[PDB]
Design a protein around this nucleic acid. Structure first.
Ligand SMILES: [Zn+2]
Ligand SMILES: [Zn+2]
Lengths: 1335, 99
RNA sequence: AUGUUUUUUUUUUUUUUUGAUUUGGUGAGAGG
DNA sequence: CCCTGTCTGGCGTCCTCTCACCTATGA
DNA sequence: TCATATTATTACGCCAGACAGGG
């Protein structure tokens, strides 16, 4: 029907072509009758007749002459909705410049006429004059004029002289502004200057000057001359219940503009003096500016009472504009809403739906069914039948329900599992019965929740509800590989009570010929549900190629494990039920069933799990009592020993032996130790309290205490909650953030007294305030993420590359945190992984790594896999099917089409609620040493010291994988060496961080080069020891006579000649920095490893600051080019740093703020990506210095650290694709033979297809540079202005798109959700393939 | 509460809100993102064009349902043409291009 | 065998199809 | 002229339910 | 009833982005 939406400026001829009549009078309506005004705002001739095909006043009351317009009516003759499309125009007496092009920041008329905003407004509000082609006088064109400047000029240049003001003058300036001429000038000005600031100031002005010439937008279209009025139907005038009309705000705005315009026409008729018509035109200017965007000028106008009234731009922008309130989200027919309840008899593809809601939602299907049978005739009869609800429409209703799915939806839908399609089962009742397992997907408890039902009307929507959105199809969460139909709380208690054991019961050690008579012995009353027993089970192992082989054997098991074996499908082994089955074990039971036997046995087995869990939890009778919370007998003596310890510490505090901070630290330490001892006392007293004999002496076992099974099963409860119900509830913290030294020694079974409950209320009010304010940032994070993603659709099958990121296991310094099988599960390898022995093709180079491949990776102990990542995908406008990976909720690769940006953005932002808002190296294991980034030297004693700061100390095992990693500073005492074998727990590293070592490479004698006591260094003989040290001063304390003196130590031989560095001809002089203290004095012979000086010195907003890419306040500074380094100017704002490369060109430098403790010396050579100071590091520096793969590893590690600290499983594909959407823009460095500009920022796919269709020719391409935009700056900088207008500020984006003449080739998800068509991702990707093919 | 078809608002062609007004469910923004997350392109297309806003689409759909033909004739939403007239009522010339 | 053999105003206009059942901002509070 | 406080604008969660209250003037 | 047309409170918290000031 139509391609792209084009936006441009509105010419006065274009506004007269939209229009149907000039709106003169401001008179709205008659108000005493019902008729409007002829001819006012709500006219007849200008727009249309209120009534359909009627002259409002009187003629044509039938259907013959539609169109005639008599003189007595001055009325058109069409439809009732004809006025909604027709718009009027107000002939503004005095020109008024647009507020969107005068105050957009930056203003469109501000950087175009080369005039400051302040000066532009002055003249615009009749407060300053502006010259326009004066003539032969001493005045510029842009230069303004004041009353005094004009008065004198008026008497001076009375002849050829022009100096107007207001929009009129402004219009002229714009009108008489040779665009083309300015281009060359600006272009020549940019090529004839070197000023950095000017360059950017000139490139931003020429960009908007050449863009205006590229389109059909004129400079004189900025000023509004023929103001357009919105259709009445769109500014509706309806009365509320009563006798008055509740009028809209736009009618106030238009009525004021028309009142003022009529006054201004009458004053220009009457020839009023100058100051009267200046105030009149100024009031018209402010009235127009208030109509368009109210409140952007000084304080907004108001009708009733002090609240400002809502203008047109406030009908567009904001949370309640048209995008976010009526075009992205709509209210919807065939929909319903009610309170949910359980109904556990359901199968997990069906839900209960009440009869009253079912007869209301399915009225047209029932009408169609009733008309088909022949029971009635006309539609009315059917509506009377279902209004009466006779006895025959319920069979009609059960025949329209049967195979027709519905979309259930819980009201805060965060990820895609919050809309699932069921089949209805009709309910006597008024509450939606919802299958319990599905509740863990919706985050739906049953404490008063409500859900909405939606009906797929058409046939393609019924098939999408059955084939994509059915609840049997969503059994794996799309964020990872974990099943989302995990059995939640009652059913794991029923299983944990069923499959367990006790050392004596009915039927101990009897033998049973099958699981059927195991259940028969449980039901008849001859054995117990947990009584250990040899049974004969027949497990089917499918060891052949798709053939199930029976093996039958006698397992020593219990009765309950055989009864649960009657429900397990064929292929799973018996050892999946042989254990005790908590919650992690039943989750991996369903996961192994899904990986082996597929989907249909896993659906039917999930239902049979839920049924048998509910049934035996009912048979269990697992209550909770007051006696179940067993108080430790050792608890009171532990509290008295802690009270004796705080008594000892305070008796030392009365005598002043210890400090106050050490007292507070000792009290918090002994109460933490006593808390851990009380928790261990109660945990022994709960986990093994049952001690029952069997045929003789006693024997112990794990307890059948009720609260212990609710904790050990993982149903509801943890260690901390069961700790607070029996042991002491810790040391609660006051809202100051610091802890309180007197704990809450009473649990909940004993009574809390008053003060302890008040401290508890501190600790809990902080948590409720944190959740109720955290949810806003979590939701706004999901919004920013799905609007930066929004476009990215799997659109190929292979990009045809060999690049991809290097997935290693991540190791922080403790034991290996996340194994390689968690990171390289289901992601397609980049090059073929060599087997760790020698040069073998273990896996090929384009294989998906599912579980079988990952097990053959874990057997061979594969180091790290080079795997394909989304950020390395070469596909223009989308992601190919291999560089994404596995489907994650489907076992296979991602299909051609499935929108991965939206599921990724939801999977990152959905756990936003669970996240929070507000010496030396000791080895642990026993293995082999390896060093990386190492340049070292052996000292005199033997410990290998390091001459490199950035050395990584890895502990490699005997197999080949890397198990530990650490960072060792410059100059540390390593107890070990390279390639060595150590023992578990042996200290291998040592240093002093408070004393920066200035250790050497060679030996010799020490001379004090440029070290003079009195100006350079100072004499501070030590007080308490006597062994003095010449203390080196810094460059700020010494005066300007000797500030140029750099103290240093250079090593010589026994004669005095300079001992050179081994490898060069340069001596090894070390320039001493500020605040140093000389350790080894003059004449002392040195060696390696000996110092030459003493140098003394996060949750959810972290996720936001990583995706939005803020800078930290003190970033780590780096080096943009390798080579030698040196210092510069002495403290003029900053302290300089000059880097001269060995082979490369010199002139790069950087002025470091000198408040940082540096890392580099003067004789040190640096590299790109090498640190100069320490602290956090901004991602833009990673991108422009190290590489794209470096910054994507930086973001995925720095945000999986937050998601792992709070314990959420998210696969890394989602963070890699939001990282792709961050660094999608690029900047040009060398324009080459293309049509770009020098420092123009252009999107990367554009410049790559440009120089890839030019490089296929003879011409060599253009060399770009990638840039990393934060997610809101990157979604507002898009080549599709509806995508950047449905999101944040619409004023800025619509003026930029209007003055650029931008066009929206739709080509994404939200443009097609706005404009009302098929999404180009899902089922509609075939439709968009067809439409893109047929052009 | 449930709604098949009844009265709507004035300015927009979408259904009213509430229970005291016999109105339908606001199919909000995150539900649209959840349908985009699946492949529900046709479910979303009737969810924002036929069931909600487009007047010719919904009258043709009601007659198509009661004839026994589950098929939608979509058209363009009315609130987007309301957007075009509110943007166009500024000094902005927003259009709809070639066939 | 036979019937101009008791005439007088005791009076002629339908439904018609063609269209629908009608409620906007502001602020406060609760559920999840 | 390159850092720099300082000022100005622009964000800040979805869905639902109940109730009340709505410009002054004026010969 | 039918045209006439706008004044005497302050008490968010970042976080970019643009601007006059000065070593
Ligand atoms: Zn007429
Ligand atoms: Zn690719």
């Amino acid at each position: 029907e139509f391609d792209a939406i084009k936006i441009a400026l509105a010419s006065p001829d274009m506004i007269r072509s939209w229009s149907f009549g000039e709106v003169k009078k401001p008179e709205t309506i008659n108000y005493r009758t019902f008729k409007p005004e002829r001819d006012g705002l709500f006219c007849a001739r200008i727009f249309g007749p209120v009534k359909d095909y009627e002259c409002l006043c009187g003629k044509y009351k039938r259907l013959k002459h539609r169109g005639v317009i008599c003189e007595k009516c001055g009325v058109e003759v069409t439809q009732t909705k004809v006025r909604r499309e027709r718009m009027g125009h107000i002939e503004l007496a005095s020109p008024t410049a647009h507020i969107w092009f005068l105050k957009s920041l930056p203003s469109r008329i501000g950087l175009l006429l080369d005039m400051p905003l302040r000066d532009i407004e002055r003249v615009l509000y009749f407060e300053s004059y502006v010259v326009i082609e004066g003539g032969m006088t001493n005045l510029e064109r842009q230069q303004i004029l004041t009353e005094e400047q004009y008065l004198d000029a008026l008497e001076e240049f009375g002849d050829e002289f022009d100096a107007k003001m207001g929009a009129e003058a402004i219009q002229a300036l714009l009108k008489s502004m040779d665009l083309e001429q300015e281009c060359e000038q600006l272009r020549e000005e940019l090529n004839e200057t070197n000023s950095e600031t000017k360059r950017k100031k000139l490139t931003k002005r020429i960009k908007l000057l050449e863009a205006f010439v590229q389109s059909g937008n004129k400079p004189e279209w900025m000023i509004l001359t023929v103001l357009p009025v919105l259709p009445p139907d769109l500014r509706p005038l309806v009365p509320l219940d009563g006798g008055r009309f509740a009028t809209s705000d736009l009618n106030d705005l238009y009525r004021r503009v028309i009142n003022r315009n009529n006054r201004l026409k009458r004053l220009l008729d009457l020839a009023a003096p100058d100051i009267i018509v200046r105030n009149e035109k100024r009031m018209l200017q402010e009235a127009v500016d208030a109509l368009l965007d109210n409140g952007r000028r000084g304080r907004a106008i108001t009708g009733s009472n002090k609240r400002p009234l809502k203008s047109l731009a406030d009908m567009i922008k904001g949370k309640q504009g048209r995008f976010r309130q009526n075009l992205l989200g709509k209210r919807v027919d065939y929909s319903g809403r009610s309170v949910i309840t359980v109904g556990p008899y359901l199968r997990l593809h069906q839900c209960g739906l009440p009869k009253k809601m079912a007869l209301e939602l399915f009225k047209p299907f029932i009408y169609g069914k009733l008309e088909l049978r022949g029971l009635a005739t006309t539609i009315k009869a059917a509506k009377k039948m279902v209004e009466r609800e006779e006895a025959v429409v319920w069979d009609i209703l059960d025949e329209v329900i049967r195979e027709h799915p519905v979309l259930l939806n819980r009201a805060p839908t965060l990820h895609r599992l919050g809309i699932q399609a069921f089949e209805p089962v009709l309910i006597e009742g008024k509450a939606i019965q919802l299958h319990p397992l599905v509740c863990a997907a919706y985050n739906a408890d049953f404490d008063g929740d409500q859900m909405a039902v939606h009906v797929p009307l058409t046939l393609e929507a019924q098939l999408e509800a059955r084939a994509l959105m059915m609840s049997t199809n969503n059994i794996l969460s799309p964020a990872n590989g974990e099943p989302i139909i995990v059995p939640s709380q009652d059913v794991v208690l029923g299983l944990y009570y069923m499959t367990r054991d006790c050392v004596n019961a009915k039927g101990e050690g009897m033998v049973l010929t099958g699981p059927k008579e195991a259940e028969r012995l449980y039901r008849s009353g001859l054995a117990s549900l947990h009584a250990r027993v040899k049974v004969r089970i027949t497990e089917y192992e499918k060891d052949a190629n798709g053939e199930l082989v029976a093996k039958t054997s006698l397992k020593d098991t219990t009765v309950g494990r055989a009864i649960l074996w009657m429900i397990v499908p064929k292929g799973l082994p018996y050892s999946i039920v042989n254990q005790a089955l908590g919650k992690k074990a039943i989750s991996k039971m369903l996961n192994t069933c899904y990986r082996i036997l597929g989907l249909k046995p896993t659906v039917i087995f999930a239902d049979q799990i839920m049924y048998t869990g509910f049934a035996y939890a009912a048979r269990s009778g697992a209550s909770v009592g007051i006696d179940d919370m067993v108080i430790p007998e050792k608890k009171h003596e532990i509290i008295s020993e802690a009270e004796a310890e705080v008594a000892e510490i305070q008796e030392q505090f009365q005598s002043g032996l210890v400090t106050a901070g050490e007292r507070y630290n000792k009290v918090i330490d002994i109460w933490a130790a006593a808390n851990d001892r009380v928790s261990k006392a109660m945990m022994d007293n709960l986990q093994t309290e049952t001690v029952i004999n069997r045929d003789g002496q006693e024997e112990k076992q794990v307890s059948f205490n009720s609260i212990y099974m609710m904790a050990d099963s993982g149903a509801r409860g943890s260690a901390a909650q069961i700790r607070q119900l029996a042991g002491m509830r810790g040391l609660m913290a006051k809202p100051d953030g610091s802890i309180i030294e007197t704990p809450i020694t009473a649990n909940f079974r004993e009574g809390l007294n008053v003060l302890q409950y008040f401290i508890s209320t501190h600790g809990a009010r902080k948590g409720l305030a944190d959740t109720a304010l955290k949810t806003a940032n979590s939701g706004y994070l999901t919004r920013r993420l799905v609007d930066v993603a929004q476009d990215l659709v799997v659109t190929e099958d292979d990009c045809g590359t060999h690049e991809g990121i290097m997935m290693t296991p991540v190791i922080e310094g403790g034991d290996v945190k996340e194994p390689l099988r968690d990171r390289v599960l289901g992601r397609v390898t980049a090059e073929d992984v060599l087997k760790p022995g020698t040069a073998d093709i273990l896996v090929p180079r384009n294989t998906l790594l599912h579980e079988q491949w990952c097990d053959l990776l874990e057997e061979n102990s594969v180091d790290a896999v080079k795997v394909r990542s989304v950020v390395s995908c070469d596909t223009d406008f989308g992601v190919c099917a291999h560089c994404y990976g596995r489907d994650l909720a489907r076992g296979h690769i991602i299909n051609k089409g499935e929108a991965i940006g939206v599921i990724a953005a939801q999977s990152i932002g959905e756990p936003g609620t669970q996240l929070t808002m507000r010496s030396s190296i000791q080895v642990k294991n026993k293995g082999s040493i390896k060093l990386s980034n190492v340049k070292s030297v052996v000292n005199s004693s033997g410990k290998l010291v390091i001459t490199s700061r950035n050395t990584e100390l890895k502990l490699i095992d005997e197999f080949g994988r890397t198990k530990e990693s650490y960072k060792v500073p410059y100059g540390a005492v390593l107890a070990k060496g390279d390639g060595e074998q150590v023992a578990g727990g042996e200290t291998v590293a040592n240093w002093d961080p408070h004393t920066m070592p200035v250790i050497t490479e060679v030996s010799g004698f020490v001379r004090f080069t440029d070290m003079i006591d009195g100006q350079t260094i100072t004499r501070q003989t030590d007080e308490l020891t006597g062994l003095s040290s010449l203390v080196v001063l810094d460059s700020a304390e010494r005066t300007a006579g000797g500030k140029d003196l750099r103290p240093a130590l250079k090593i010589v031989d026994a004669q005095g000649n300079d001992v050179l560095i081994p490898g060069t001809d340069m001596p090894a002089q070390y320039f001493l920095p500020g605040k140093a203290i000389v350790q080894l004095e003059d004449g002392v012979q040195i060696s390696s490893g000996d110092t030459l000086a003493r140098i003394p010195q996060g949750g959810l907003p972290r996720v936001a600051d990583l995706f939005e890419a803020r800078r930290p306040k003190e970033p780590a500074i780096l080096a943009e080019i390798s080579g030698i380094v040196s210092f510069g100017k002495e403290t003029k704002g900053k302290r300089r740093l000059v880097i001269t490369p060995v082979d490369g060109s010199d002139p790069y430098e950087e002025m470091i703020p000198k408040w940082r403790q540096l890392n580099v010396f003067e004789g040190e050579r640096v590299e790109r990506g090498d640190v100069i100071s320490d602290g956090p590091e901004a991602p833009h520096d990673i991108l422009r210095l190290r590489g794209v793969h470096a910054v994507t590893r930086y973001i995925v590690n720095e945000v999986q650290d937050v998601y792992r600290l709070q314990g959420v499983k998210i696969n890394d594909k989602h963070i890699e694709v939001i990282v792709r959407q961050m660094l999608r823009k690029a900047t040009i460095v060398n324009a080459g033979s293309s049509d770009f500009l020098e420092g123009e920022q252009v999107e990367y796919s554009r410049v790559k297809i440009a120089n890839r269709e030019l490089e296929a020719n003879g011409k060599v391409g253009a060399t770009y540079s990638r840039d990393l935009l934060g997610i809101t700056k990157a979604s507002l900088a898009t080549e599709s202005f509806i995508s950047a207008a449905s999101f944040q500020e619409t004023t800025r984006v619509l003026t930029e798109a209007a003055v650029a003449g931008k066009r929206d080739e739709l080509r994404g998800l939200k443009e097609n959700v706005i404009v009302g068509r098929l999404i180009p991702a899902g089922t509609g990707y075939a439709y968009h393939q067809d439409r893109m093919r047929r052009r | 509460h449930a709604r098949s078809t009844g009265s709507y608002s004035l300015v927009t062609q979408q259904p009213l809100g509430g229970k005291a007004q016999f109105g339908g469910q606001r199919f909000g923004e995150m539900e649209v993102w959840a349908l985009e997350a699946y492949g529900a392109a046709y479910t979303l297309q009737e969810m924002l064009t036929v069931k909600s806003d487009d007047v010719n689409g919904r009258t043709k759909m009601y007659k198509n349902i009661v004839d026994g033909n589950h098929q939608m004739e979509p058209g363009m939403p009315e609130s987007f043409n309301v957007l075009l007239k509110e943007i166009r009522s500024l000094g902005i010339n927003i259009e709809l291009e070639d066939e």
